[PDB]
Subunit: 174 residues, 6 copies
Amino acid sequence: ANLKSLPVGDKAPEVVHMVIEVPRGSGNKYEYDPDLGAIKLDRVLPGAQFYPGDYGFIPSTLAEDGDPLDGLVLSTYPLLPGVVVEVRVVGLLLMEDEKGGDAKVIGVVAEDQRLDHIQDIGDVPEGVKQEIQHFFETYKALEAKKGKWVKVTGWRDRKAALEEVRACIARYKG
Amino acid sequence: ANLKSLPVGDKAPEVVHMVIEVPRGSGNKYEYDPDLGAIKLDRVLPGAQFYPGDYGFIPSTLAEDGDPLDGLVLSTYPLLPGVVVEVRVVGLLLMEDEKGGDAKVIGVVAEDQRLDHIQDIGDVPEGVKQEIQHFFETYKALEAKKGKWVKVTGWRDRKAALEEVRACIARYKG
Amino acid sequence: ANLKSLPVGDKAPEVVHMVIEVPRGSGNKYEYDPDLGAIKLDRVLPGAQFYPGDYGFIPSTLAEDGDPLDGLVLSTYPLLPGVVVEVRVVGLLLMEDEKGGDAKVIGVVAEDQRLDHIQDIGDVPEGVKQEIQHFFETYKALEAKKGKWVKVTGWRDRKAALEEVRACIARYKG
Amino acid sequence: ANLKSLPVGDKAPEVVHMVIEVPRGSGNKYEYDPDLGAIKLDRVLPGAQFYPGDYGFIPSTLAEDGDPLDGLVLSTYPLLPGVVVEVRVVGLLLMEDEKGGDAKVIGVVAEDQRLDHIQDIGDVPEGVKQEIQHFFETYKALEAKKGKWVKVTGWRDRKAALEEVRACIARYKG
Amino acid sequence: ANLKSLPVGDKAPEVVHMVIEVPRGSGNKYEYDPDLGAIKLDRVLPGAQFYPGDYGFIPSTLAEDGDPLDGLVLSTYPLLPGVVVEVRVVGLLLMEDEKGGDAKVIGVVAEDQRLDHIQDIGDVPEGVKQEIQHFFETYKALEAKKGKWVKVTGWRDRKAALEEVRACIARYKG
Amino acid sequence: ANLKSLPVGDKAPEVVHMVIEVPRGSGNKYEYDPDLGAIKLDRVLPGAQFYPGDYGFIPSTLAEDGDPLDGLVLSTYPLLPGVVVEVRVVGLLLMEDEKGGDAKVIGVVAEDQRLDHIQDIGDVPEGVKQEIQHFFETYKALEAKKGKWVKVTGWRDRKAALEEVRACIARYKG
């Protein structure tokens, strides 16, 4: 259709719809292209790395950067590009990249009983939070000479995330 | 498009079109959502299980339960969500679930020479039929407290299946 | 949408858009069906084989055989059916099949730094070129009794490929 | 060598050596055979299931049943049959099987920072504990007619587990 | 230990021990090396192929070619190099290779209920037998210039296979 | 046996024996333990990374650090822990780690026709060399607080590597 304009979901902002672009464990950086109306390969990560969780965007949201709000989902099994999943929001990852400031939503697959226990950011084990941060700090390292860069600023809890979700939802309506 | 309304196929009812929702070997229960027009994750199975064959529905059919007729396909290699495959009908799996009675079609990938020998239900090895039944009898066991349940009634041959296919085809035209 | 009519790309003919039908390493021969508007399974290869690279077609091109121009991509990680990737053209594989003459484009994922060194056909290692040829010469061997056949004629360099790309692009406009 | 007689480890009983027999996610039930001195396939699970964690035994221990003490490990990535890993003991799974009473040790890979947070049984999410229990209650269901059976009695904490580890260690020395 | 001298098994010749060298689905041609006492990589198949079933040898047997008797096993899930599995003998594959005449045993994993129905060669579906034959006729095709070759002579039933098993068992005792 | 004392091979130093410890694509850092005589898990890498090639050691060699000479192999398909493979030496990776100076051998699977073209370090594509270096510079980043560190010094050609191989071979004899 036009995945970027799917409804954000009825349980929003606590539980939102997310379009998965990159499965967890993948080094193939895919993206949904509204113009082509299909998933395109943006690039293959240059280092021996993979996304630490499933990556996608929240449909019908607009970040301050003009794109929908992005997020990383903790899943039991990696998802596939282009599928829609209800995600429970538990936190934010703040970072500064080439382009500017940025905040990514941290969520868990809402319909997986194995994760019912992750309700706030303090619930994501720190071994996992360190893996995520280290990913974002090195994954664009081989693309420096291409002017890409990233710095991780810090983490925020479920209350802060919901406020950002709400604001990107409003902004999209505008 | 709208996968639920694709043509059932020219060789129907003997050979029908099927939209695959869940690959064999997957614990990610996906479903096609006509309203969203995309594959959505309905849920992750709570137990350490996986679909014993590829699961999907027959487009342009309507079961007595108001949904298209569902079915399980025996394949050499697991398929992917959202692909269309011609399936040869060889039997029925009768079951009673929370909601009510139900019959699933048992089929084989029509264009795979390794399976040309499976022509009727008596051709599906019983080690395989037991695996299928045991799947449907335990997979919703951890979702009891959520009011889900299932009981397997029995198996039917290719003649019975064709009659149900024909009837759900008619009913869809209505 | 209609993947066959997506734009061929701005960097064409040197760098073109390709719709992936079969991932590298797959024995599931998928194809995009414009009529159904979905990926369908054409068949499962009968032998214990898999595509030596990702297979798909160039959108908005028309070969002399009336279909878009087909091609094989060298990738670091197998792609998925239905995704669009920018491919750098480095050569041609000429062959004669049941139906007739045929030329397939040989390309590399354009946005993968691990492959930046493959710029012409002479850059594809010959151990790899032999694997490709042997694939096309035996993969339809079990489908002879079904009147399918193939013979590999030879390889052509990036200059020849570009000329064919350009010609199938023109022809599509017609 | 003789994996059953490897040292239990210096940090025992808190951290013990474990010989992995079945990787997590596997349906191939392997076992180490001291007599043959190799990993043998005991059987393929009859249902569409897989071990919910890596399964193996503690070397140089003897349970009341005459075999070494068995255990299930929570890992980030499945292990391989025959490798030795240091496992941190956090709990016990009590069960009754055909043969008799039984207690399995629940542990986590000791050298994986992503799991440093699992220190006692109350730390294993209950969605995970339910998956484990349901596995042991249904996995031998298709082997009933072969006189196999299992009932899960309950869970015990790290203090109880250590006591059993210590006792099977002593008993082995005997 | 010395896998080549493990016991052939108590249920021999009907059910024999087999040391798996190459998992089904693998292109890595491993072999057990008695001299090194370890699994070594003999070579990577040059074509885009994989073993159609798990390959290994029967311990304590000696073929007319001076090596133990080789065989191909039909399994539900690929096995791993160096594991021992009880295999039920159902047939023979006769072939002529560079070196000479040769007969491979065709078997099924004995302890997998999904295969209990394969009791003689006539039970291996012909789509499967064609895949096996085509494998052996093309897999050494890229190694011709290295003087390797193979021709498949025909298939034999469980009675013929047992006779060969018995004879290679006797011969080993010698 | 004792993998550390296997023969280095007859074609040494040009082609050497290597015991694989970590498959390419793995995050499970295994090691052969002579004392236990088995493969043990040393640790799970803390970041979302994997070895860029298969890692192991050359048997019957002794580096200046008292351990056998280590190396990274370029393979078509990842290998398994504990298998022996003949590796063709094409270069050296010099680095400084916590402990001290270090040089790793860079090799290719000798019996894989797809790699026959990699004969010297200048033949390893630079997209690949950058991936390797970036791996070694970040993989121990989350283990800093554990006093681990690494710096990559540079690369050396096949002539330099052979000299180091020869020297570690001599030293082992001592």
